[PDB]
Amino acid sequence: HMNATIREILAKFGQLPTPVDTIADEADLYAAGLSSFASVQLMLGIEEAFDIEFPDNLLNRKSFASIKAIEDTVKLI
Amino acid sequence: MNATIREILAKFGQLPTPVDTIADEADLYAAGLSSFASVQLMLGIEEAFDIEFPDNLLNRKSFASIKAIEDTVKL
Amino acid sequence: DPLDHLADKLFHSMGSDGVYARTALYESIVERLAALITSHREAGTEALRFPPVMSRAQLEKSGYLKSFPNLLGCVCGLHGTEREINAAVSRFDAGGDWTTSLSPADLVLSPAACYPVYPIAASRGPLPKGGLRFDVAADCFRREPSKHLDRLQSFRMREYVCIGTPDDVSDFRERWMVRAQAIARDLGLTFRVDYASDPFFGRAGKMLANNQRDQQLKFELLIPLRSEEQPTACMSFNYHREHFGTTWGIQDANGEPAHTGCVAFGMDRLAVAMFHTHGTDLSAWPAKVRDILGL
Amino acid sequence: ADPLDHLADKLFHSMGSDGVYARTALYESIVERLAALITSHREAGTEALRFPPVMSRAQLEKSGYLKSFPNLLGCVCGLHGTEREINAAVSRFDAGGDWTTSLSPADLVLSPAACYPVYPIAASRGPLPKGGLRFDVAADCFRREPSKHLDRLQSFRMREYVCIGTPDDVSDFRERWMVRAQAIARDLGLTFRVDYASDPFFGRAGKMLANNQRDQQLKFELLIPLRSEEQPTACMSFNYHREHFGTTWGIQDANGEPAHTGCVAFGMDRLAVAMFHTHGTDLSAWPAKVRDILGL
Numbered sequence A: 001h002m003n004a005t006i007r008e009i010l011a012k013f014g015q016l017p018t019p020v021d022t023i024a025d026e027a028d029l030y031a032a033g034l035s036s037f038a039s040v041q042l043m044l045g046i047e048e049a050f051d052i053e054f055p056d057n058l059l060n061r062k063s064f065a066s067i068k069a070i071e072d073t074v075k076l077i
Numbered sequence B: 001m002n003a004t005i006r007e008i009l010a011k012f013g014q015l016p017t018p019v020d021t022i023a024d025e026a027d028l029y030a031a032g033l034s035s036f037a038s039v040q041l042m043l044g045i046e047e048a049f050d051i052e053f054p055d056n057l058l059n060r061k062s063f064a065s066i067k068a069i070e071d072t073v074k075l
Numbered sequence C: 001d002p003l004d005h006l007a008d009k010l011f012h013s014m015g016s017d018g019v020y021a022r023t024a025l026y027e028s029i030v031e032r033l034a035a036l037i038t039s040h041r042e043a044g045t046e047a048l049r050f051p052p053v054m055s056r057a058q059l060e061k062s063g064y065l066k067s068f069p070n071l072l073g074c075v076c077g078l079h080g081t082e083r084e085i086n087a088a089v090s091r092f093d094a095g096g097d098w099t100t101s102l103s104p105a106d107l108v109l110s111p112a113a114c115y116p117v118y119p120i121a122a123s124r125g126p127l128p129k130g131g132l133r134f135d136v137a138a139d140c141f142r143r144e145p146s147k148h149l150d151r152l153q154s155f156r157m158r159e160y161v162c163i164g165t166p167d168d169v170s171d172f173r174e175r176w177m178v179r180a181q182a183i184a185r186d187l188g189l190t191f192r193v194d195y196a197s198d199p200f201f202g203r204a205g206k207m208l209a210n211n212q213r214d215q216q217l218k219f220e221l222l223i224p225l226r227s228e229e230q231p232t233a234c235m236s237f238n239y240h241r242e243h244f245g246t247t248w249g250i251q252d253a254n255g256e257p258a259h260t261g262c263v264a265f266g267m268d269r270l271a272v273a274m275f276h277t278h279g280t281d282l283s284a285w286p287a288k289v290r291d292i293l294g295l
Numbered sequence D: 001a002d003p004l005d006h007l008a009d010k011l012f013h014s015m016g017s018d019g020v021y022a023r024t025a026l027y028e029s030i031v032e033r034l035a036a037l038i039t040s041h042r043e044a045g046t047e048a049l050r051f052p053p054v055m056s057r058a059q060l061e062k063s064g065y066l067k068s069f070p071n072l073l074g075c076v077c078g079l080h081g082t083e084r085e086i087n088a089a090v091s092r093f094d095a096g097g098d099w100t101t102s103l104s105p106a107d108l109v110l111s112p113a114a115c116y117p118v119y120p121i122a123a124s125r126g127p128l129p130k131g132g133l134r135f136d137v138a139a140d141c142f143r144r145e146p147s148k149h150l151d152r153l154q155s156f157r158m159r160e161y162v163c164i165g166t167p168d169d170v171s172d173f174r175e176r177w178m179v180r181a182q183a184i185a186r187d188l189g190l191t192f193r194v195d196y197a198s199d200p201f202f203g204r205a206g207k208m209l210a211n212n213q214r215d216q217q218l219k220f221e222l223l224i225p226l227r228s229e230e231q232p233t234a235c236m237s238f239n240y241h242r243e244h245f246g247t248t249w250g251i252q253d254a255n256g257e258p259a260h261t262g263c264v265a266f267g268m269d270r271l272a273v274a275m276f277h278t279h280g281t282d283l284s285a286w287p288a289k290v291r292d293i294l295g296l
């Protein structure tokens, strides 16, 4: 379920060209078309949908490189 | 006329001496009436009476003395 | 408009009337004009350079709101907390209006170069005999959008200011009325000088302008740019009597409230006048003008 | 106390506002020599533009300044109402109240950095030529951050060289300038180091942008000890924006891809202050080589 939530947010804020249905768990979101500003909205979108807040240690490109990276990060939090 | 002018000149004139000391013929400028006070005074004459000066009589001369003001009003 | 053809070589659009990017050609002439004015600076003059903003409190105290409130640019910002600010920004993203969250700072855009000099003069105590003389400059602002190249919202002003007795200022005034004309002549410019008035605001402003004109407190050097019937004021001399001396508590050497006066150079108007008069090809400028400017 | 404080007497006069000062002839002569020194190092084929202290609010909004530094922005507001309304606002001021309640926003802001207006100008020219475009820009800039420290001003002069082109055009430009700027700083007898850094992006979202900027080394600063050797002051910056502004403004490089941009920025007031902090306020006592470099 956590997986699909993240996916809806990625369509909410992500500003990607190809649909989230057309993106695998371990896939390059930045190559896919995730911009800097977008990745920040996405991060805020994640924070809103899961009512959580990231540590500054994970407030970076790495944590949001892929849905799997996102899922693992949210889980590890 | 002098009834209402000594009230305004005291209100907006911002002079060192009180309005009950000016001789109704003496120079208000040598008394201490600054430029910006003088315009607040002009504006006070247009609010206590229902009239606006023409830009012709709208000047230093029309506000030199208290008698200068009063005369201007009738015209 | 006759000046419009100059824009191509002098300016680039910045998406706002009266606010332009300056080309290297344009700036090279502004700089030479500034150096020329400096070469005529009189003895004993203290040079100060002001930023494009000044204290709102100082300007309020100067009386600017009683004269030109409609021309003032105030600095405002988003002063709230992170959530408040984020809310405003969010409204912008949403299509709403973030500017509703703006509140005034303690700063305004300077309307003229001389205002900051009066409290500085006052802080030094009574004036010496002979008074004080200042050379001031600032980027000034006036809220009057226009497409005419001689009517800008942001423009450079250069001023020589005299603070002293009535005789000091009158002597300074006579000198600068002569020198300003001699500068314009050396620059090959055509002009006349006439008395005029500042654009005071409102009905009270009508009396003020009348008094200023009647008392000859303001002279302008006027250059035909778009027409001879509507010339452009490119230099002025302003006599303030004791207005600023009283406002700021400046005492002359006799213990009386100081008089002040200044000669003002509109650097952007003079530059535009040079290009309108002499063209955008510097190599063809009259030899005497080139020599005068050190080209 | 701040080691810089004692400089104030020779360099500045108070204007009744922290971070806003009048400049003395002494100070201005050094700002001017520093500007001429920077100009003497300009690369061939660089177009010089000078900007006023205000720019279009619509242009600044579009550049994304509100999502990044909303807290630093200075907007221009004015009394846009009727004569009656304006007179009333003035009358409230005479009666102990606040005239500023009658203000409304203009279409202008005070410029926060000198480069912003250059991007639409470049965009208006069509596709970039091969090698891209380079600009020499300057403006009096504003950032709403009051401080009593002489190295932290609200109104200050910025000088920049800007490159707009392919990723390679821009990264080589930045490397050329990082070397050249350090050589200039050494010629000026300044002590410094160059470290990577990040802009002060605002809020939670800003911590992430700041993290990525640092991680990707998009911003170097040349740092000079003024107040302390532990908290040195950034007096120049070397910035890489990738395609952010090329994308925003629809700028296309000669290959038809969204252009990259970068800039080298000189904080003129910080550099001047650094010179006076480093060599003192008597110019005849400056090292002969420094005087020579500056044409004194």
Ligand SMILES: NCC(=O)NS(=O)(=O)OC[C@H]1O[C@@H](n2cnc3c(N)ncnc32)[C@H](O)[C@@H]1O
Pocket: C111, C112, C113, C114, C142, C144, C150, C151, C152, C153, C155, C157, C159, C198, C233, C234, C235, C236, C238, C262, C263, C264, C265, C266, C267, C268, C269
């Ligand atoms: N304290 C002395 C003074 O302020 N005086 S004055 O208010 O009269 O403007 C000084 C000078 O600034 C120039 N100037 C004024 N307004 C503009 C404008 N909108 N665009 C371009 N240049 C301008 C013009 O050359 C004028 O003579």
Ligand SMILES: NCC(=O)NS(=O)(=O)OC[C@H]1O[C@@H](n2cnc3c(N)ncnc32)[C@H](O)[C@@H]1O
Pocket: D112, D113, D114, D115, D143, D145, D151, D152, D153, D154, D156, D158, D160, D199, D234, D235, D236, D237, D239, D263, D265, D266, D267, D268, D269, D270
């Ligand atoms: N466009 C590229 C850029 O903006 N880059 S940067 O934002 O990094 O600032 C450019 C430079 O302006 C100087 N500077 C910045 N803020 C201040 C301030 N408050 N007071 C004095 N100097 C300052 C400082 O030297 C800094 O390196």
Ligand SMILES: [Cl-]
Pocket: C155, C156, C157, C265, C266, C267, C268, C269, C270
């Ligand atoms: Cl001007």
Ligand SMILES: [Cl-]
Pocket: D156, D157, D158, D266, D267, D268, D269, D270, D271
């Ligand atoms: Cl600076």
Ligand SMILES: [Zn+2]
Pocket: D113, D114, D115, D116, D160, D239, D263, D264, D265
């Ligand atoms: Zn820049």
